[PDB]
Amino acid sequence: WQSYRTRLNTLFARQLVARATTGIDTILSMETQNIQEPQLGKGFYATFV
Amino acid sequence: YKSRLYLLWLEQKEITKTETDYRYELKLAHIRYDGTWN
């Protein structure tokens, strides 16, 4: 949209499948909630302090 | 694949060309979290 990129889908579940192999206890862990997904097209991350 | 159990298999379909020949297809399926299959 203009210069904006809005994420529509997620790969979270795709990765969750592996986490899930140890049961709920992992699924609901904080660590699981920190799963990362790929950036939206060409671009970069930067911290503007 | 990705810790999920999948089955991968080959099937043969008999098709009239008369003469007979066969089509080959590969199918893949997996177990879902509730134990059922897709």
Cα-Cα-Cα-Cα dihedral sign, residues B13, B17, B19, B21: negative
Q: Which residue of B has its CA nearest to A14?
A: B2
Instruction: Read off the DSSP letter of residue B29.
Output: E
Q: A16-45 burial, b if ≥16 CB within 10 A, otherwise e?
A: beebbeeeeeeeeeeeeeeeeeeeeeeeee
B residues 1-38 closer than 8 Å to A (CB): 2-4, 33
Distance of residue A24 Cα from the nearest chain B Cα, in angstroms: 11
**Resolution rounded to one decimal, in angstroms:** 4.0
Contacts of B3 in chain A (CB under 8 A): 17-18, 21
